[PDB]
């Protein structure tokens, strides 16, 4: 199923 990444400010 879906795989979520981790989103942050670069």
């Amino acid at each position, epitope marked *: *199923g*879906v*795989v979520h990444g*981790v*989103a942050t*400010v670069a």
Partner: nanobody
Amino acid sequence: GGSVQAGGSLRLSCTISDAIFSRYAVGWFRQAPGKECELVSTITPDSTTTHSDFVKGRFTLSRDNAKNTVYLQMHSLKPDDTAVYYCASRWRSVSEGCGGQGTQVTVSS
């Protein structure tokens, strides 16, 4: 999260499972306050990038050359770009794209 004045810029990073990063498209999604999840753009392992119609060249995607990270570079930000931004792969619907850990982007007039 990150916050700017209208007209500003922001870069977001997405770190995702190495097995996924190497093999599958990674999508960026966003969800504005009181609105539904929407797909923004995608990038494949060969750096083919797709964009939704509302991006209009302002947001661009790239892959890090060494790490399992995708970058979303945003320029010319406007208040209606305020949203939580998420990244995902292998989604079964656009709704699933906003189910993970997102980062809040705020653009003030």
